[PDB]
Short mmCIF file of C-alpha atoms and ligand atoms in Angstrom, two decimals:
data_model
loop_
_atom_site.label_atom_id
_atom_site.label_comp_id
_atom_site.label_asym_id
_atom_site.label_seq_id
_atom_site.Cartn_x
_atom_site.Cartn_y
_atom_site.Cartn_z
CA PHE A 9 0.06 -0.30 -0.39
CA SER A 10 2.75 2.23 -0.57
CA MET A 11 4.29 1.04 -3.34
CA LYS A 12 5.10 3.87 -6.61
CA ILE A 13 4.76 2.27 -10.08
CA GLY A 14 6.47 4.43 -12.39
CA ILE A 15 5.25 3.63 -16.20
CA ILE A 16 6.74 4.74 -19.39
CA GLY A 17 5.69 4.62 -22.81
CA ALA A 18 6.13 7.11 -26.06
CA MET A 19 3.39 7.87 -28.03
CA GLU A 20 -0.10 9.30 -27.01
CA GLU A 21 -1.63 6.14 -28.50
CA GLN A 22 0.03 3.96 -26.73
CA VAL A 23 -0.41 5.11 -23.07
CA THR A 24 -3.86 6.77 -23.76
CA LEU A 25 -5.68 3.52 -22.58
CA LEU A 26 -3.90 3.64 -19.10
CA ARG A 27 -4.12 7.42 -18.56
CA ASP A 28 -7.86 7.05 -19.11
CA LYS A 29 -8.02 4.53 -16.72
CA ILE A 30 -6.02 6.43 -13.67
CA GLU A 31 -8.25 7.34 -10.42
CA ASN A 32 -7.62 10.80 -8.77
CA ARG A 33 -5.33 11.36 -11.95
CA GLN A 34 -3.43 15.04 -12.02
CA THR A 35 -1.09 16.19 -15.15
CA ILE A 36 2.59 17.48 -14.75
CA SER A 37 4.03 18.88 -17.67
CA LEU A 38 7.39 19.34 -17.63
CA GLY A 39 10.77 19.05 -19.65
CA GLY A 40 8.48 18.58 -22.47
CA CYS A 41 6.55 15.45 -21.36
CA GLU A 42 3.77 14.66 -19.58
CA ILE A 43 3.28 12.59 -16.37
CA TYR A 44 -0.18 11.35 -15.23
CA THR A 45 -0.45 10.65 -11.47
CA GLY A 46 -3.14 9.01 -9.81
CA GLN A 47 -3.96 5.23 -9.00
CA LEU A 48 -4.60 2.25 -11.17
CA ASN A 49 -6.80 -0.33 -9.69
CA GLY A 50 -6.26 1.14 -5.79
CA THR A 51 -2.02 1.57 -7.19
CA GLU A 52 -0.50 4.33 -6.90
CA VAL A 53 0.99 4.78 -10.71
CA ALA A 54 3.01 7.93 -12.23
CA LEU A 55 2.19 7.28 -16.46
CA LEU A 56 4.72 9.15 -18.36
CA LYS A 57 4.97 10.26 -22.34
CA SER A 58 8.06 10.51 -23.73
CA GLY A 59 8.21 11.00 -26.87
CA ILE A 60 9.94 8.77 -29.27
CA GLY A 61 13.75 7.25 -29.47
CA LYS A 62 16.42 7.43 -26.74
CA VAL A 63 17.56 10.78 -25.83
CA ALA A 64 13.72 11.86 -25.25
CA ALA A 65 13.11 8.55 -23.71
CA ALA A 66 16.57 8.95 -21.83
CA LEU A 67 15.07 12.51 -20.48
CA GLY A 68 11.67 11.67 -19.12
CA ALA A 69 12.73 8.44 -17.15
CA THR A 70 16.21 10.88 -15.47
CA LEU A 71 12.53 13.58 -15.38
CA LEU A 72 10.27 10.32 -13.63
CA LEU A 73 12.68 9.15 -11.41
CA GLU A 74 14.21 12.05 -9.94
CA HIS A 75 11.01 13.79 -9.90
CA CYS A 76 8.10 11.23 -9.18
CA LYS A 77 10.99 8.69 -7.38
CA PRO A 78 8.81 5.44 -8.16
CA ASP A 79 9.64 1.92 -7.19
CA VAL A 80 10.23 0.06 -10.33
CA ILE A 81 9.49 1.10 -14.01
CA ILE A 82 7.66 -0.82 -16.15
CA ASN A 83 8.41 0.40 -19.90
CA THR A 84 5.30 -0.29 -22.52
CA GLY A 85 4.74 0.05 -26.04
CA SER A 86 4.95 -1.87 -28.57
CA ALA A 87 7.43 -3.48 -30.62
CA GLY A 88 8.88 -5.39 -34.27
CA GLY A 89 8.80 -9.13 -33.81
CA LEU A 90 12.25 -10.63 -34.26
CA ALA A 91 11.61 -14.10 -32.61
CA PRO A 92 9.75 -16.97 -34.94
CA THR A 93 7.05 -17.49 -32.93
CA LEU A 94 5.84 -14.11 -32.73
CA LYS A 95 2.41 -12.91 -34.40
CA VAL A 96 0.86 -9.53 -33.91
CA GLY A 97 -0.59 -9.14 -30.79
CA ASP A 98 1.53 -11.30 -29.11
CA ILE A 99 3.94 -10.00 -26.17
CA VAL A 100 7.38 -9.59 -25.66
CA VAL A 101 8.90 -9.66 -21.69
CA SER A 102 13.05 -8.27 -21.37
CA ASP A 103 15.36 -10.25 -19.93
CA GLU A 104 17.68 -8.17 -20.96
CA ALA A 105 18.01 -4.69 -22.84
CA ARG A 106 20.62 -3.42 -25.68
CA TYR A 107 21.61 -1.05 -27.84
CA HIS A 108 21.66 -2.56 -31.41
CA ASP A 109 23.14 0.63 -32.93
CA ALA A 110 25.87 1.47 -30.18
CA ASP A 111 29.54 0.98 -31.61
CA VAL A 112 32.60 1.41 -30.10
CA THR A 113 33.97 -1.02 -31.46
CA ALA A 114 37.03 0.28 -32.57
CA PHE A 115 38.36 0.77 -29.13
CA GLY A 116 37.35 -3.17 -27.92
CA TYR A 117 34.17 -2.47 -26.55
CA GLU A 118 31.28 -5.29 -26.59
CA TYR A 119 29.32 -4.54 -30.18
CA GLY A 120 26.25 -2.16 -28.35
CA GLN A 121 27.97 -1.48 -25.39
CA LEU A 122 28.54 1.93 -24.51
CA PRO A 123 31.97 2.86 -22.55
CA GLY A 124 31.15 3.16 -18.78
CA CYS A 125 27.86 0.64 -19.05
CA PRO A 126 27.73 -2.80 -19.08
CA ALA A 127 26.98 -4.62 -22.53
CA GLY A 128 23.38 -5.18 -21.79
CA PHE A 129 21.27 -4.20 -19.19
CA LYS A 130 19.17 -6.68 -17.33
CA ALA A 131 15.66 -6.52 -16.36
CA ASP A 132 14.42 -7.04 -12.93
CA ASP A 133 14.25 -10.98 -11.91
CA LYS A 134 10.52 -10.44 -9.67
CA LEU A 135 9.39 -7.82 -12.51
CA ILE A 136 10.12 -10.84 -14.92
CA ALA A 137 8.51 -13.30 -13.08
CA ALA A 138 5.09 -11.43 -12.42
CA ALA A 139 4.66 -10.24 -15.71
CA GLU A 140 5.09 -14.49 -16.39
CA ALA A 141 2.32 -14.84 -14.65
CA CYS A 142 0.64 -12.33 -15.72
CA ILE A 143 0.82 -14.06 -19.18
CA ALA A 144 0.05 -17.52 -18.14
CA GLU A 145 -3.35 -16.01 -15.89
CA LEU A 146 -4.39 -13.78 -18.72
CA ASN A 147 -3.37 -16.95 -21.36
CA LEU A 148 -1.68 -14.79 -24.05
CA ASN A 149 1.23 -15.96 -26.35
CA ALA A 150 4.46 -14.53 -24.89
CA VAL A 151 8.15 -14.46 -25.36
CA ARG A 152 10.77 -13.83 -23.04
CA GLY A 153 14.44 -12.80 -23.95
CA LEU A 154 16.83 -9.89 -24.83
CA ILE A 155 15.13 -6.65 -26.73
CA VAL A 156 17.01 -4.65 -28.67
CA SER A 157 16.73 -0.67 -29.03
CA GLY A 158 18.16 2.19 -31.44
CA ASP A 159 16.74 5.45 -33.13
CA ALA A 160 15.64 3.80 -36.55
CA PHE A 161 12.29 2.32 -37.41
CA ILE A 162 13.75 -1.21 -38.60
CA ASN A 163 11.77 -2.28 -42.16
CA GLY A 164 13.00 -4.80 -43.45
CA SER A 165 16.17 -4.40 -46.32
CA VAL A 166 19.66 -3.82 -44.16
CA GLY A 167 18.33 -2.77 -41.20
CA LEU A 168 16.74 -5.86 -40.52
CA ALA A 169 19.32 -7.70 -41.72
CA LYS A 170 22.28 -6.09 -39.89
CA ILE A 171 20.09 -6.53 -36.38
CA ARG A 172 19.60 -10.10 -36.86
CA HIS A 173 23.34 -10.72 -37.14
CA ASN A 174 24.36 -9.02 -34.52
CA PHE A 175 21.94 -10.26 -31.84
CA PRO A 176 20.61 -13.80 -33.19
CA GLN A 177 18.97 -13.94 -29.95
CA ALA A 178 17.30 -10.60 -29.99
CA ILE A 179 13.27 -11.96 -29.74
CA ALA A 180 11.98 -8.27 -31.00
CA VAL A 181 13.24 -4.35 -31.08
CA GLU A 182 11.92 -1.36 -30.56
CA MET A 183 13.33 2.22 -29.73
CA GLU A 184 13.17 2.77 -26.35
CA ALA A 185 13.34 0.43 -24.04
CA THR A 186 17.24 0.27 -23.74
CA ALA A 187 17.48 3.96 -22.75
CA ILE A 188 15.30 3.71 -20.06
CA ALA A 189 17.56 0.44 -18.71
CA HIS A 190 20.36 2.54 -18.95
CA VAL A 191 18.65 5.14 -16.73
CA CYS A 192 17.26 3.17 -14.03
CA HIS A 193 20.96 1.28 -14.31
CA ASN A 194 22.08 4.43 -12.92
CA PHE A 195 19.44 5.38 -10.55
CA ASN A 196 19.85 1.61 -9.32
CA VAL A 197 15.66 0.96 -10.02
CA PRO A 198 14.27 -2.00 -11.05
CA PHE A 199 12.95 -2.13 -14.57
CA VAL A 200 11.05 -4.50 -17.01
CA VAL A 201 9.89 -3.82 -20.65
CA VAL A 202 6.73 -5.46 -21.33
CA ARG A 203 6.02 -4.46 -25.20
CA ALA A 204 2.88 -5.99 -27.91
CA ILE A 205 4.20 -6.49 -31.53
CA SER A 206 2.92 -4.51 -33.84
CA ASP A 207 4.71 -5.78 -37.03
CA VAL A 208 7.71 -8.34 -37.19
CA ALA A 209 10.14 -5.27 -38.89
CA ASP A 210 10.13 -6.01 -42.71
CA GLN A 211 9.91 -4.17 -46.16
CA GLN A 212 5.84 -4.04 -44.33
CA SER A 213 6.84 -3.00 -41.18
CA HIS A 214 5.65 0.83 -41.48
CA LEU A 215 2.20 -0.52 -43.33
CA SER A 216 1.19 -3.69 -40.24
CA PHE A 217 2.39 -0.43 -37.24
CA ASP A 218 -0.26 1.37 -38.87
CA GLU A 219 -3.13 -1.32 -39.15
CA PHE A 220 -2.35 -2.70 -35.67
CA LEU A 221 -1.37 -0.22 -32.79
CA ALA A 222 -4.50 -0.09 -31.66
CA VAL A 223 -4.10 -3.95 -31.04
CA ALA A 224 -0.38 -3.45 -29.64
CA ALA A 225 -2.22 -0.49 -27.22
CA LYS A 226 -4.49 -3.06 -26.31
CA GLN A 227 -2.81 -5.71 -25.44
CA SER A 228 -0.15 -4.27 -23.44
CA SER A 229 -2.14 -2.09 -21.97
CA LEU A 230 -3.88 -4.83 -20.55
CA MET A 231 -0.94 -6.58 -19.21
CA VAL A 232 0.83 -3.64 -17.74
CA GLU A 233 -2.68 -2.85 -15.92
CA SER A 234 -2.35 -6.68 -14.48
CA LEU A 235 1.03 -6.34 -13.68
CA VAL A 236 0.26 -2.95 -11.85
CA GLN A 237 -2.45 -5.31 -10.19
CA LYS A 238 -0.53 -8.68 -9.25
CA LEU A 239 3.19 -6.65 -8.44
CA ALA A 240 1.30 -4.01 -5.43
CA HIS A 241 -1.13 -7.34 -4.25
CA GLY A 242 -0.32 -11.17 -6.32
CA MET B 11 24.64 34.67 -14.93
CA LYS B 12 25.65 30.61 -14.54
CA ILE B 13 27.41 28.78 -17.28
CA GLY B 14 26.90 24.85 -17.71
CA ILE B 15 29.35 22.85 -19.41
CA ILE B 16 29.16 19.30 -20.51
CA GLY B 17 31.93 17.32 -21.29
CA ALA B 18 32.05 13.31 -22.01
CA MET B 19 35.36 11.96 -20.35
CA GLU B 20 36.90 12.38 -17.23
CA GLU B 21 40.27 13.05 -19.50
CA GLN B 22 37.93 16.34 -21.57
CA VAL B 23 36.79 17.91 -18.06
CA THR B 24 39.42 17.38 -15.68
CA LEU B 25 41.41 20.53 -17.21
CA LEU B 26 38.21 22.25 -16.37
CA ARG B 27 37.50 20.66 -13.25
CA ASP B 28 41.29 22.15 -11.88
CA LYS B 29 40.21 25.16 -12.32
CA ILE B 30 36.92 26.11 -10.83
CA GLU B 31 37.75 27.74 -7.80
CA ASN B 32 35.30 27.52 -4.60
CA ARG B 33 34.44 23.88 -5.42
CA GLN B 34 31.92 21.48 -4.81
CA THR B 35 30.58 18.30 -6.29
CA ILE B 36 27.47 16.89 -6.39
CA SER B 37 27.02 13.22 -7.44
CA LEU B 38 23.48 12.24 -9.04
CA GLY B 39 21.97 9.96 -11.63
CA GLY B 40 26.01 8.30 -11.74
CA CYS B 41 27.01 11.97 -13.12
CA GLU B 42 29.21 14.13 -11.50
CA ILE B 43 28.63 18.38 -11.31
CA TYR B 44 31.43 20.80 -10.34
CA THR B 45 29.82 23.72 -9.29
CA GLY B 46 32.11 26.62 -8.36
CA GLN B 47 33.86 29.87 -10.57
CA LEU B 48 35.84 29.47 -13.52
CA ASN B 49 37.90 32.70 -13.39
CA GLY B 50 35.33 34.55 -11.64
CA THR B 51 32.28 32.77 -13.97
CA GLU B 52 30.21 30.95 -12.48
CA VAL B 53 29.41 27.13 -13.49
CA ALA B 54 27.95 23.45 -13.65
CA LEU B 55 30.34 21.76 -15.30
CA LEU B 56 29.15 17.84 -15.49
CA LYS B 57 31.15 14.66 -16.77
CA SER B 58 28.17 13.25 -19.10
CA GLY B 59 29.67 9.44 -20.19
CA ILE B 60 29.94 9.00 -23.72
CA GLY B 61 27.21 8.52 -26.01
CA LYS B 62 23.79 10.47 -26.45
CA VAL B 63 21.53 8.27 -23.33
CA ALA B 64 24.26 9.19 -21.15
CA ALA B 65 24.52 12.54 -22.46
CA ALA B 66 20.68 12.99 -22.51
CA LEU B 67 20.24 11.85 -18.37
CA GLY B 68 23.35 14.09 -17.69
CA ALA B 69 22.32 17.15 -19.58
CA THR B 70 18.68 16.52 -17.93
CA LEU B 71 19.79 16.71 -14.12
CA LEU B 72 22.44 19.69 -14.84
CA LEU B 73 18.84 21.75 -16.49
CA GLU B 74 16.80 21.25 -14.11
CA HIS B 75 18.94 21.36 -11.05
CA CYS B 76 21.48 24.11 -11.58
CA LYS B 77 19.54 25.78 -14.09
CA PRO B 78 22.38 26.95 -16.16
CA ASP B 79 21.67 29.97 -18.71
CA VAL B 80 23.11 28.63 -21.39
CA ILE B 81 25.18 25.46 -21.98
CA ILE B 82 28.54 24.95 -23.44
CA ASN B 83 28.98 21.37 -24.66
CA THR B 84 32.39 20.33 -25.21
CA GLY B 85 35.42 17.66 -25.88
CA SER B 86 36.13 15.57 -29.31
CA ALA B 87 35.21 14.90 -32.44
CA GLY B 88 36.09 13.31 -36.06
CA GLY B 89 37.12 15.85 -38.46
CA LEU B 90 34.47 15.85 -41.80
CA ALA B 91 35.27 19.09 -43.00
CA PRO B 92 38.48 19.09 -45.60
CA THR B 93 40.44 21.56 -43.84
CA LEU B 94 40.15 20.60 -40.73
CA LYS B 95 43.11 18.85 -38.99
CA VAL B 96 43.94 17.64 -35.03
CA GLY B 97 43.91 20.62 -32.63
CA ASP B 98 41.09 23.00 -34.54
CA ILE B 99 38.10 23.70 -33.39
CA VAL B 100 34.73 23.45 -34.80
CA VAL B 101 31.67 25.43 -33.78
CA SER B 102 27.84 24.05 -34.02
CA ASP B 103 25.50 26.20 -36.51
CA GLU B 104 23.58 23.18 -35.34
CA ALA B 105 23.19 19.67 -34.66
CA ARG B 106 21.60 16.88 -36.10
CA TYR B 107 21.65 13.02 -35.39
CA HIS B 108 23.23 11.04 -38.38
CA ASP B 109 22.01 7.81 -36.56
CA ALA B 110 18.40 8.24 -36.35
CA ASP B 111 15.94 7.15 -38.91
CA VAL B 112 12.11 7.03 -39.05
CA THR B 113 11.98 7.82 -42.67
CA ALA B 114 9.40 5.04 -42.77
CA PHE B 115 6.64 7.59 -42.04
CA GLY B 116 8.06 10.18 -43.70
CA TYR B 117 10.02 12.61 -41.35
CA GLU B 118 13.34 13.82 -42.66
CA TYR B 119 16.17 11.19 -42.39
CA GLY B 120 17.98 11.95 -38.64
CA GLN B 121 14.89 13.28 -37.67
CA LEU B 122 12.58 12.17 -34.74
CA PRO B 123 9.23 12.50 -34.41
CA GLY B 124 8.60 15.35 -32.07
CA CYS B 125 11.34 17.18 -32.74
CA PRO B 126 12.79 19.77 -35.59
CA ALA B 127 15.11 17.41 -37.84
CA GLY B 128 18.00 19.46 -36.38
CA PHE B 129 18.60 21.71 -33.44
CA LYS B 130 20.37 25.41 -34.01
CA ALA B 131 22.45 26.81 -31.57
CA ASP B 132 22.26 29.71 -30.53
CA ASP B 133 23.67 32.93 -32.77
CA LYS B 134 25.47 34.77 -29.27
CA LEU B 135 27.12 31.86 -28.59
CA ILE B 136 27.85 31.09 -31.56
CA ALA B 137 29.48 34.94 -32.08
CA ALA B 138 30.94 34.80 -28.93
CA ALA B 139 33.28 31.45 -29.87
CA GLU B 140 33.87 33.23 -33.05
CA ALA B 141 35.46 36.15 -31.61
CA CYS B 142 37.67 34.26 -28.94
CA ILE B 143 38.64 31.54 -31.78
CA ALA B 144 39.97 35.00 -33.95
CA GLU B 145 41.90 36.69 -30.77
CA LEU B 146 43.61 33.47 -30.05
CA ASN B 147 44.45 32.93 -33.78
CA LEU B 148 42.92 29.19 -33.50
CA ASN B 149 41.89 27.27 -37.08
CA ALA B 150 38.51 26.77 -36.69
CA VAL B 151 35.05 26.03 -38.93
CA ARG B 152 30.98 26.16 -38.61
CA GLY B 153 28.58 24.25 -39.04
CA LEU B 154 26.80 21.43 -38.74
CA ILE B 155 27.98 18.94 -36.42
CA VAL B 156 26.16 15.51 -36.18
CA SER B 157 26.18 12.84 -33.03
CA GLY B 158 25.32 9.17 -32.58
CA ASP B 159 26.23 6.10 -30.60
CA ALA B 160 29.09 4.87 -32.85
CA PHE B 161 32.45 5.93 -33.24
CA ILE B 162 33.53 6.33 -37.05
CA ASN B 163 36.46 4.62 -38.86
CA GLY B 164 35.95 5.07 -42.22
CA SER B 165 34.24 2.40 -44.28
CA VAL B 166 30.79 1.93 -44.67
CA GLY B 167 29.93 4.28 -41.71
CA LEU B 168 31.75 7.51 -42.70
CA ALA B 169 30.12 6.47 -46.30
CA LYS B 170 26.50 6.54 -44.86
CA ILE B 171 27.14 9.79 -43.03
CA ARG B 172 29.20 11.52 -45.63
CA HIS B 173 26.10 10.49 -48.12
CA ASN B 174 23.10 12.06 -45.34
CA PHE B 175 24.99 14.90 -44.69
CA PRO B 176 27.95 15.62 -47.28
CA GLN B 177 27.68 19.43 -45.23
CA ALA B 178 28.56 17.94 -41.74
CA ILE B 179 31.72 19.26 -40.13
CA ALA B 180 32.18 16.82 -38.15
CA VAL B 181 30.94 14.11 -35.76
CA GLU B 182 30.75 12.93 -32.43
CA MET B 183 28.71 10.84 -29.78
CA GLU B 184 26.77 13.97 -27.81
CA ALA B 185 26.33 17.16 -29.46
CA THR B 186 22.54 16.46 -30.50
CA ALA B 187 21.70 15.22 -27.45
CA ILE B 188 22.11 18.09 -25.30
CA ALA B 189 21.26 19.79 -27.58
CA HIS B 190 17.57 17.88 -27.98
CA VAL B 191 17.11 18.30 -24.07
CA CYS B 192 18.17 21.76 -24.36
CA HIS B 193 15.86 22.51 -26.58
CA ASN B 194 12.94 20.50 -24.72
CA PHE B 195 14.02 23.42 -22.18
CA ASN B 196 14.27 26.41 -23.77
CA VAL B 197 17.72 26.62 -23.13
CA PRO B 198 20.38 28.40 -25.97
CA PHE B 199 23.53 26.23 -25.82
CA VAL B 200 26.73 26.09 -28.73
CA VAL B 201 29.16 22.88 -29.33
CA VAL B 202 32.83 23.49 -29.09
CA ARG B 203 35.28 21.15 -29.18
CA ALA B 204 38.71 19.65 -30.91
CA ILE B 205 39.48 17.70 -33.69
CA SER B 206 41.13 14.56 -32.34
CA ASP B 207 40.71 12.67 -35.30
CA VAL B 208 39.55 12.46 -39.14
CA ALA B 209 37.00 9.93 -38.70
CA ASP B 210 39.01 7.48 -41.20
CA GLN B 211 40.05 4.42 -40.98
CA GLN B 212 43.33 5.25 -38.47
CA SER B 213 40.41 7.11 -36.42
CA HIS B 214 41.25 5.09 -33.61
CA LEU B 215 44.66 5.03 -32.91
CA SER B 216 44.68 9.07 -34.45
CA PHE B 217 41.94 9.62 -30.87
CA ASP B 218 44.56 7.38 -28.78
CA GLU B 219 47.80 9.79 -30.08
CA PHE B 220 45.37 13.58 -29.61
CA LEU B 221 44.06 12.68 -26.52
CA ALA B 222 45.42 15.30 -24.11
CA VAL B 223 46.29 17.77 -27.42
CA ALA B 224 42.60 17.61 -27.91
CA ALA B 225 41.49 18.11 -24.37
CA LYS B 226 44.24 20.88 -23.72
CA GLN B 227 42.47 22.65 -26.90
CA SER B 228 39.09 22.66 -26.25
CA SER B 229 39.48 23.53 -23.00
CA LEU B 230 41.22 26.47 -23.49
CA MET B 231 38.58 28.08 -26.05
CA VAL B 232 35.82 27.14 -23.02
CA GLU B 233 37.76 29.21 -21.04
CA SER B 234 37.58 31.86 -23.27
CA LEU B 235 34.69 31.60 -24.17
CA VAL B 236 33.08 31.90 -20.88
CA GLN B 237 35.28 34.19 -19.90
CA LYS B 238 33.63 36.77 -22.72
CA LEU B 239 30.33 35.68 -22.35
CA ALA B 240 30.79 36.77 -18.75
CA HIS B 241 32.73 40.35 -18.91
CA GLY B 242 32.96 41.05 -22.63
C1 SR1 C 1 6.85 4.94 -34.77
S1 SR1 C 1 8.41 4.92 -34.58
C2 SR1 C 1 7.76 3.28 -33.30
C3 SR1 C 1 7.27 3.33 -32.14
O1 SR1 C 1 6.81 2.42 -31.25
C4 SR1 C 1 7.53 1.94 -30.52
O2 SR1 C 1 7.38 2.27 -28.89
C5 SR1 C 1 9.01 2.16 -31.14
O3 SR1 C 1 9.96 1.97 -29.33
C6 SR1 C 1 8.53 4.03 -30.68
O4 SR1 C 1 8.30 4.38 -29.78
C1 SR1 C 2 35.94 7.55 -27.06
S1 SR1 C 2 34.46 7.72 -28.43
C2 SR1 C 2 34.83 9.29 -28.51
C3 SR1 C 2 33.93 10.06 -27.46
O1 SR1 C 2 35.22 11.13 -27.81
C4 SR1 C 2 33.90 12.42 -28.17
O2 SR1 C 2 33.67 13.34 -27.45
C5 SR1 C 2 33.03 11.51 -28.60
O3 SR1 C 2 31.09 12.62 -27.60
C6 SR1 C 2 32.68 10.48 -27.29
O4 SR1 C 2 32.20 10.97 -26.23
N1 ADE C 3 9.76 -2.03 -36.80
C1 ADE C 3 10.55 -1.16 -35.81
N2 ADE C 3 11.64 -0.81 -35.89
C2 ADE C 3 11.30 -0.55 -34.66
N3 ADE C 3 10.62 -0.23 -33.43
C3 ADE C 3 9.63 -0.22 -33.60
N4 ADE C 3 7.98 -0.81 -32.59
C4 ADE C 3 7.16 -1.28 -33.12
N5 ADE C 3 7.90 -1.43 -34.17
C5 ADE C 3 9.11 -1.26 -34.62
N1 ADE C 4 35.67 9.19 -35.45
C1 ADE C 4 34.73 9.65 -33.79
N2 ADE C 4 33.39 9.53 -33.88
C2 ADE C 4 32.45 9.81 -33.03
N3 ADE C 4 32.71 10.81 -32.01
C3 ADE C 4 34.14 11.30 -32.58
N4 ADE C 4 34.85 11.71 -31.38
C4 ADE C 4 35.94 12.11 -32.15
N5 ADE C 4 35.93 11.27 -32.97
C5 ADE C 4 34.76 10.86 -33.19
#
């Protein structure tokens, strides 16, 4: 009864459903980001709409941490599926997060790793578990694994193949997860990514994203709502 | 007036950290902020770490806490403009991401949704920097600086930047992130960095050889600029 859960989403459509569910909501506007406070099923939450990309997410994650001091962070939104058994709508939960577009290999850093940072960032084990519990209880299809981020919308061709080559175990790709993980790592705050698949990152990813965002928002949202419930009670 | 200064590597901010008097260190979000005076001018120097997220994070803490009036981003860079040479100075007219790509939806290459395609550095700050470059007889170039989370070492990487930004004068890894954050906070900025390599196949070796040189030059520039900004 005194846990505050931070939730971060990039686009308005990706956070709109959850924003409308917040009881006693209030709006805080800062650094070009918006933070909704209130409760979601009796649980105190702080929902930030960050904007797209690594820097936007970092700026927002920093404002959320520094200002709302949430206990854990859940990054939601959509993603391009890379793992074979993923279909539009299915859930992906992060085990870990890595930048697919960071490269200081010229200095002997592991591909994806930035100097001063670990090669990848680990999601909180308990958060991952509660998320798997929800996945099982809602009976949805999900895959747990490495999620990779970059400042590009993958659309097949070279972009896609480079990622597949460098991160064969990557189960999905998007644009904010690793930045949020990087910031939480610095603030020593537990995180977990729970996203719904909107496309498969090929030549059709753009059209698929357009046709299925409502579906990904709904599916990811249901999971987040359920995860907050699960986390604060069980 | 308080001038905020951001640099990535310790080696890149240590000379400046040393001259700060009435010095205090604040440790937060895994970044260090050194507040005090640099030759009579109030400053806040942040060692951010390498890359866009590291810089965005550091910049946000700096702005949201020390509330500087302007931001000076320093450090080094890979020369792209034909006349640049190790030690030379590049000044930002503007900064753009060379690795952001959401063109699949119609944004300009390098542009992220919700942001202008590029971020303009402050005219006054640019003018002051040019006056210092002139007063110190330094060889410098002004123009577009492109940032990315990759160290450029010729080959395909360099080719991609030549192709999307034939006009870029230099490449590095934090500038646009800092510009982006200053944008959201309405804080003017300017980038002043020294060339440590020319981003070719030997950039790694050259970065290694001229580490110190870069640090000294960029530092000298920053001290002069701070001074000019605060006392004419
Ligand atoms: C419109 S670019 C794709 C967006 O959806 C996912 O959440 C990505 O991370 C990005 O925010
Ligand atoms: C060690 S990778 C190159 C570094 O020097 C420049 O300042 C870049 O921005 C990065 O911080
Ligand atoms: N294909 C893709 N690339 C990047 N971010 C995405 N988010 C959802 N689909 C994506
Ligand atoms: N070649 C290069 N690429 C990226 N950042 C740099 N900083 C200095 N040289 C660089």
